Ligand binder design. Structure first.
Ligand code: HEM
Ligand SMILES: Cc1csc(C)[n+]1C
Length: 291
């Protein structure tokens, strides 16, 4: 496969900035979801799960085809709970029927991070919806019950190296795990709907205790009321990953700069951009626009 980026016919920066402004205004408004966490966390988890099916060996999966819209990917056990992020974005797709599904699912993630006080993420338009038979089979998304060796081997299929993997995993400060979705339960820190380096600081400063939860799965619990997954806890058990965790814990700006670069790379894997294509757009936040 080659997947060439094609701009939605006739659309420019200001059209996309209107879809972003509409996702951000609805984030402001539906602030009660999941005990007042808001939809920001499930929207960046939707943007990474539609991108994480990519396989570098044959160019299949990835964000291009917007295939989550199909039953097979939608009903994938690893995608339980993302139906909430889909339902949120659906009125917005009726308001802007011209934007592709992959472009909308991925911009939902960019909007959520920037509106949660994260770094600016450059975003590129051009994904094209593809047929139901291009939909990737289930089982390409990662297990939580595993170690640092599995994590490194997994992220190599998306050719993400160590620093990219540690920066990307910093998004687990956001939101929480839910027992009925994944068999895990609990938050990862205090500020779980503001984007900060808190995941790293909690992983270095809490007194973590291994326990089984109500689903019979193990997780790392702390006195404070926080939890970490086995794969999260892996980042301080591996010596290469641990020097990077310490770097981000001492420097949130370096974390922002590296998360920005890696999240964009994750959203654009498997897509060729012609050089006639527009440069990546930097969207303004509501606040920047006075809205
Ligand atoms: C080895 C990698 C990863 C594994 C095994 C993993 C696993 C999980 C699991 C089990 C949950 C809880 C789901 C639930 O019960 O609702 C979760 C939540 C979440 N994940 Fe990951 N994750 C990984 C990588 C990432 C990456 C790379 C991102 C983002 C760049 C990400 C973002 C999120 C977000 C934001 C949540 C919170 C969702 C919410 O509050 O509803 N994860 N993850
Ligand atoms: C720590 C962690 C891993 S997945 C998730 C949601 N949290 C809060």
């Amino acid at each position: 496969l080659v997947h060439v980026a094609s701009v939605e016919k006739g659309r420019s920066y200001e059209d996309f900035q209107k879809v972003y402004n509409a996702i951000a205004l609805k984030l402001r408004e539906d602030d009660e979801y999941d005990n007042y966490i808001g939809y920001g966390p499930v929207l960046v988890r939707l943007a990474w799960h539609i991108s994480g099916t990519w396989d570098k060996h044959d160019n299949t999966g990835g964000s291009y085809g917007g295939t989550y819209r199909f039953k097979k990917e939608f009903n994938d056990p690893s995608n339980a709970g993302l139906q909430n992020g889909f339902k949120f974005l659906e009125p917005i797709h009726k308001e802007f029927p011209w934007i592709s599904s992959g472009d909308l699912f991925s911009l939902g993630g960019v909007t959520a991070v920037q509106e949660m006080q994260g770094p600016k993420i450059p975003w590129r338009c051009g994904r094209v919806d593809t047929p139901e038979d291009t939909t990737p089979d289930n089982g390409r998304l990662p297990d939580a019950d595993k170690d640092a060796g599995y994590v490194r081997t997994f992220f190599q299929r998306l050719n993400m190296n160590d620093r990219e993997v540690v920066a990307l995993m910093g998004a687990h400060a956001l939101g929480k795990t839910h027992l009925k979705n994944s068999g895990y339960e609990g938050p990862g820190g205090a500020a779980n709907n503001v984007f900060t380096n808190e995941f790293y600081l909690n992983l270095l400063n809490e007194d973590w205790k291994l326990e089984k939860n109500d689903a019979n799965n193990e997780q790392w619990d702390s006195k404070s009321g926080y939890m970490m997954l086995p794969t999260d806890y892996s980042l301080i058990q591996d010596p290469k990953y641990l020097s990077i965790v310490k770097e981000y814990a001492n420097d949130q700006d370096k974390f922002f700069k590296d998360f920005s670069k890696a999240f964009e790379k994750l959203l654009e894997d498997g897509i060729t951009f012609p050089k006639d294509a527009p440069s990546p757009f930097i969207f303004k936040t509501l606040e920047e626009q006075g809205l």
